[PDB]
Assembly symmetry: C3
Homo-oligomer: 114 residues x 3
Amino acid sequence: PMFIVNTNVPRASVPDGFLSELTQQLAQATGKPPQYIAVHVVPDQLMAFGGSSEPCALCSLHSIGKIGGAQNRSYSKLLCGLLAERLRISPDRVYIAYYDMNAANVGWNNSTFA
Amino acid sequence: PMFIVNTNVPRASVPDGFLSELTQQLAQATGKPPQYIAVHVVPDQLMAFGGSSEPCALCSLHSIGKIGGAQNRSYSKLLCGLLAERLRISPDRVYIAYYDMNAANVGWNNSTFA
Amino acid sequence: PMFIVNTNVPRASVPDGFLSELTQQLAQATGKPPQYIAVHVVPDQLMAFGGSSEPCALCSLHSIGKIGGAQNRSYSKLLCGLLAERLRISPDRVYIAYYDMNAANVGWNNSTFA
């Protein structure tokens, strides 16, 4: 799985250990080994959410499987929770795009996962 | 909706008010309330289009519905127009990827839109 | 086609001519003219892969057609090869998301490719 967060929160507001926390929590949530989890945090961005430049985040979670209605609700609760606690972003100022990727459409290590 | 634009145009060349202009015009074009529109502008990027580093943009528009052949043509005319007028990017140096998202695949406010 | 790479490798480690090399090689691999190829390299990123922050990359390739199992295996070999040779990123720390885009879902030059 791959999780990306783009936010207007400044770099200094991102706590040390945040990438590790995301890795661990996503491994637990998705059930995938942490070795397969990649995380990418992009602070200091020029963004607006509903016209407002108050703290916000636009995120994506791509996974081969482990994506669906109930799972995505649970991921949203988890990830909005983390972004509220750690980055002080309101859950109602977060969007997360979920992508259920076909194994043949993910490249890794000179091949694909198919 | 989420609209993201990555560009090699420098930050100083992005005019004041541009995120609000995008928010407004996207609300009008998609028919969605402005409160649901998020926008993200990323200048100063290391990119090429057709092998050239002349001004260019790579963009995406994600929406739950309001995506289709005619609608996307309309959005492209709008958005290329804005990028030309405001950022001086030629329309034939812009790509926009459109994504029609299932509501169950968009997280917001600790849940999804489903 | 459009290829984006986000990496924690610093900007100074991206060699001169890299965007051109990607453009050329992708033109050949996809079979599309280089005039149609766009490339975007984002260095200095805050990322982890498998819990650690050795060089890594998260990438996407979007194309109208020219996407499928065998082709994506070939793209992965090409692209991992380039990132290993040029950016010294291990292939096992690269993920590439492939997207087969409908022509009506790609904007360009005030309209779509439909």
